[PDB]
Design a protein around this ligand. Structure first.
Ligand code: EBT
Ligand code: EBT
Lengths: 218, 31, 218, 31
């Protein structure tokens, strides 16, 4: 209960790596991780990996303006290694403790999605066997999330909806097949509409819409 | 919400701020 | 020239500690640190110490709601130690390389001010001989900055003006004598007005004004 | 500018955001 508590301080402080540590500890200590716990843990990794992805994009872009290039390129390297470490950190934890114990629809989809997202982050920057094996692992985590979600969750559900959102960015960006992207996006949007009769869902439906108009306009 | 909750939003804030002359990096929205 | 370059990447990336490292290296390598260099260096420390001061305030506040308290209190500890290290880092550097070589009015005031600000950050959280010796070091760095500034810089100058701003927060907050605070603030504001006949100065004059109306209203 | 350039501004953004129920911490503006 303590490490959770400690988790919220780190979060209040915006010291996210420490938030990770605490949340790792939390899971080993534990049985069925709770909704609160699972969310904290995810927020923590979300922010730690998020800061690296941002810096990585800003530097890659700089590297692009530039063609120095190898300074930039050494630097990106170091950021690239931090990336492997976090994705590494939370992936393992997903096999060992997280996924195996999932007792319910949402929970499996939630975790299977995380797993997808983290291989997805390995895929944005890796280049070799690693990119390939990351693209694949990704496709297959999303897909089994998809099979469960699309069958047990309401189309309006933040998880079904966030899955579809990330799943199709994978296509658009990693596999680089737009077509498959827009269809998955469009599909997930339309059947949320079929059932609109709130508020994490609402955002996500708009992000799908923005991605489509943006993928349509190339 | 988009700058709080999404990488793409965040990264845009940050580069509008940094005064970055660099041409637009390519991203979509993910959660 | 390289480490400067590297400095701007770290800054573009918002990896500020690394920005510090680079900027430290930069100074040892160097003779008269340039306006660009001195500013980068300061921005870097500004942000690294800034993030700690923020987390420290948010946690102290939490500690306050709470009277757990000792978790919070261990945590604050760790943040408190990071604080000593950075202030420590840039203080030394100020004696060794920075201040001794200052060739001009602005530069001495600039550095003498930094020195004041960093003892000032030690003072916000230290408690013993250290608070006392930090309060003193602070008063005396600001004061010699003041003597030069108020005599060689225009009242409208970002440095004269930022000095006065921080100098009086020291009184208000550290020495805890308001009176001395408002007078120093008011004075620095009025003679900028006497001479208004832009844009880092303009901000600062408003921060003085906001501090006064806030110190007046207790 | 005040939230960008000052600790007090920053710290206020952050706590408005965090949903923090805690009563106001005391700071003035420094540069
Ligand atoms: C609506 C939610 C699903 C998104 C939410 N993310 C969070 O709470 C994070 O603190 C930031 N908003 C995400 C972030 C981190 C770093 C950079 C840019 C954006 C989450 O993890 O649940
Ligand atoms: C107008 C200037 C004198 C203030 C300016 N500060 C900067 O460029 C920093 O990136 C942030 N604005 C200050 C900060 C850091 C951390 C938390 C809150 C605010 C500076 O150092 O020159």
């Amino acid at each position: 209960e303590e490490n959770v508590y400690m988790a919220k301080l780190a979060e209040q402080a915006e010291r996210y790596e420490e938030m990770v540590e605490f949340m790792e500890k939390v899971s080993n200590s534990l049985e069925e991780l709770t909704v609160e716990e699972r969310n904290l843990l995810s927020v923590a990794y979300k922010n730690v990996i998020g800061a690296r992805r941002a810096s990585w994009r800003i530097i890659s872009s700089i590297e692009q303006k530039e063609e120095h290039v190898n300074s930039i390129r050494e630097y990106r390297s170091k950021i690239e290694n931090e990336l492997s470490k976090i994705c590494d950190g939370i992936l393992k934890l997903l096999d060992a403790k997280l996924i195996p114990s999932a007792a319910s629809g949402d929970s499996k989809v939630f975790y299977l999605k995380m797993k997808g997202d983290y291989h997805r982050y390995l895929a944005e920057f890796k280049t070799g066997a690693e990119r390939k094996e990351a693209a694949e692992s990704t496709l297959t985590a999303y897909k089994a999330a998809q099979d469960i979600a699309t069958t047990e969750l309401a189309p309006t559900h933040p998880i079904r909806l966030g899955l579809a959102l990330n799943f199709s960015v994978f296509y658009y960006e990693i596999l680089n097949s737009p077509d498959r992207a827009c269809n998955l996006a469009k599909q997930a949007f339309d059947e949320a509409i079929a059932e609109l009769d709130y508020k994490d869902s609402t955002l996500i439906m708009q992000l799908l819409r923005d991605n489509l108009t943006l993928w349509t306009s190339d | 919400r988009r700058e709080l909750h999404t990488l793409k939003g965040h990264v845009e804030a940050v580069v509008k701020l940094k005064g970055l002359d660099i041409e637009t990096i390519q991203q979509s929205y993910d959660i």
